[PDB]
Amino acid sequence: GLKAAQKTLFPLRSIDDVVRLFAAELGREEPDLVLLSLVLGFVEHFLAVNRVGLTYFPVADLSIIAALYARFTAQIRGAVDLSLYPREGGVSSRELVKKVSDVIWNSLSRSYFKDRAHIQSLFSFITGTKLDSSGVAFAVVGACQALGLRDVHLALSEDHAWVVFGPNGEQTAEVTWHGKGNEDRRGQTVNAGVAERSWLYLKGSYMRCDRKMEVAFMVCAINPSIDLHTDSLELLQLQQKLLWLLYDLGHLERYPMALGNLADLEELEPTPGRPDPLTLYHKGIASAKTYYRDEHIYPYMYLAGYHCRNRNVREALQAWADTATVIQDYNYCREDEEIYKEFFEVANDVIPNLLKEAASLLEAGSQGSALQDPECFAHLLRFYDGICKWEEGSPTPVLHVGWATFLVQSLGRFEGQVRQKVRIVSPVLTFQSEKMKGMKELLVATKINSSAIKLQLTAQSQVQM
Ligand SMILES: FCc1nnc(N2CCN(c3ncnc4sc(CC(F)(F)F)cc34)CC2)s1
């Protein structure tokens, strides 16, 4: 069960009391993932899922939390017999990790909506027998820690989760599902996905969590949403405070998305005497560059979205061009659909809306407009260049004529006299993709040749008779 020293802060009567509990666990050799997730899922359930009776904060009584902890630990200890899986050198075996994964999986409800909110925590596992995809992975890691398997840790990409374990922490194992329909490699390594250079496995530049970073994950996993138009202020505040705690302790150093999430919160409600959201976005980017070979897409997408929301068009374009410059060195593979959808929405909805507004504000006398800045046109072109390069040597195609219509529209937003100022070298820009190299003369012409652009972008061979 819980240690006497873990129980002394109960009952938890406020956000700050939950923060104190996290501070205490984080000061321990090994923070207790099961305890912490149970507390978070409890407080989340009574602040976002069922607010009936709420007066300030759902009090977390020790008797309630200890009973939940006991249900978890007994379920796992009862189902996983460790004597059957001998441990050399303080390291777990692939069979043991698979067993734990099987226990978690076989405990879940046969049928449910697998991307509902609030199914991420151990509280949900225990009270609802429901977990989302990365919730299963986290639950495997928490179950492993509860079994004393110190080597089993959470591994995270930008769209998937699995575990690492074994000698030197060098082994990988699939423990959960990914996406929709995708058919199990449960129990297998991730080395095939790494070898194929898909975004989903980050060319091996994925996060290998220590226990502190596992705490950070569960804090990022808090979901303040009450419905589509309403967030829990209490849960926002709790997540923000918990992320600052982690930050001050050093545990967001290797966690770009967490710094992004904290920047996003700070934009919504800034904490006096903290770094601005911009600074936090840039620390996320710096983290990706330092620890992950600058192979992450979301650090730039978080920046871009901030600049977008604030109508810093130039800086939004730049950051989306940087997103593309990351993606260009990946192969577009089957299970990377989420990042395709994001690039599709930026190219075909967000950019067009932004430039449409720019064009009206131009007509209204704007000065320093993105549409009169050749550097902005260059960013636009680099964005497409990365997408085209990504497409090169991918099994499936990325671009198609639906992209071409928006590209022509977006180019058309910039006058000839602006477009002709970008210097495309073999503002200065170098193209990496063959599509954009062959488009160069079309791009800087007075009248945009729409049909020729479409053929170049889509590699459509012929025009109709
Ligand atoms: F583009 C700007 C973004 N805004 N929100 C973004 N995300 C929301 C928060 N996200 C995350 N934030 C912290 N950690 C993780 S780990 C992970 C992969 C998973 F779910 F485990 F399989 C996702 C994710 C995912 C990306 S990106």
Curated annotation (Swiss-Prot):
Q: Where is this region: Interaction with FANCD2?
A: 193-365
The outcome of changing A263P is: In parathyroid tumor
Q: Cite the effect that the entry attributes to A378P.
A: In MEN1; also found in isolated hyperparathyroidism
Q: Which GO molecular function entries does the Swiss-Prot or TrEMBL record give?
A: chromatin binding; double-stranded DNA binding; four-way junction DNA binding; phosphoprotein binding; protein-macromolecule adaptor activity; R-SMAD binding; transcription cis-regulatory region binding; Y-form DNA binding
* Biological process annotations from GO: DNA damage response; DNA repair; MAPK cascade; negative regulation of cell cycle; negative regulation of cell population proliferation; negative regulation of cyclin-dependent protein serine/threonine kinase activity; negative regulation of DNA-binding transcription factor activity; negative regulation of DNA-templated transcription
Q: What is the effect of changing E234K?
A: Found in isolated hyperparathyroidism; likely pathogenic
* InterPro entries in alphabetical order: Menin
Q: List the GO terms this entry assigns under cellular component, sorted alphabetically.
A: chromatin; chromosome, telomeric region; cleavage furrow; cytoplasm; cytosol; endoplasmic reticulum lumen; histone methyltransferase complex; MLL1 complex
Superkingdom per UniProt:
Eukaryota
Effect annotated for changing A161F: Reduced interaction with KMT2A
Q: Does the keyword Nucleus apply?
A: yes
Tell me what effect the entry lists for D264R. Reduced interaction with KMT2A
Effect of mutating E269R? Reduced interaction with KMT2A
Q: What is the effect of changing L246P?
A: Found in isolated hyperparathyroidism; likely pathogenic
Annotated phenotype, changing E267R: Reduced interaction with KMT2A
Q: In which tissues is it expressed?
A: Ubiquitous.
Which coarse location class describes where this protein primarily resides? nucleus
Q: Name one Pfam family in it.
A: Menin
* Protein purpose: Essential component of a MLL/SET1 histone methyltransferase (HMT) complex, a complex that specifically methylates 'Lys-4' of histone H3 (H3K4). Functions as a transcriptional regulator. Binds to the TERT promoter and represses telomerase expression. Plays a role in TGFB1-mediated inhibition of cell-proliferation, possibly regulating SMAD3 transcriptional activity. Represses JUND-mediated transcriptional activation on AP1 sites, as well as that mediated by NFKB subunit RELA. Positively regulates HOXC8 and HOXC6 gene expression.
Q: What is the protein's quaternary organization?
A: Component of the MLL-HCF complex, at least composed of KMT2A/MLL1, MEN1, ASH2L, RBBP5, DPY30, WDR5, HCFC1 and HCFC2. Component of the menin-associated histone methyltransferase complex, at least composed of KMT2B/MLL4, MEN1, ASH2L, RBBP5, DPY30 and WDR5. Interacts with POLR2B. Interacts with POLR2A phosphorylated at 'Ser-5', but not with the unphosphorylated, nor 'Ser-2' phosphorylated POLR2A forms. Interacts with FANCD2 and DBF4. Interacts with JUND (via MBM motif); inhibits the interaction of JUND with MAPK10 and the phosphorylation of JUND by MAP kinases MAPK8 and MAPK10.
* Disease per UniProt entry: Familial multiple endocrine neoplasia type I: Autosomal dominant disorder characterized by tumors of the parathyroid glands, gastro-intestinal endocrine tissue, the anterior pituitary and other tissues. Cutaneous lesions and nervous-tissue tumors can exist. Prognosis in MEN1 patients is related to hormonal hypersecretion by tumors, such as hypergastrinemia causing severe peptic ulcer disease (Zollinger-Ellison syndrome, ZES), primary hyperparathyroidism, and acute forms of hyperinsulinemia. MEN1 inactivating mutations are responsible for hyperfunctioning of the parathyroid glands and subsequent primary hyperparathyroidism. Primary hyperparathyroidism can occur in isolation or in association with multiple endocrine neoplasia.
Q: What is the name attached to this protein's record?
A: Menin
Q: What organism does the UniProt record list as the source?
A: Homo sapiens (Human)
